[PDB]
Amino acid sequence: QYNNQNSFV
Ligand SMILES: C[As](C)(=O)[O-]
Ligand code: NA
């Protein structure tokens, strides 16, 4: 299973 959560703020 693959999860990549990115946040740029
Ligand atoms: C190798 As996969 C994208 O089925 O977790
Ligand atoms: Na997988």
Side-chain angles (χ1 to χ4, degrees):
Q1 293 164 321
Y2 176 102
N3 175 68
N4 171 214
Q5 293 158 314
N6 297 316
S7 174
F8 302 88
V9 182

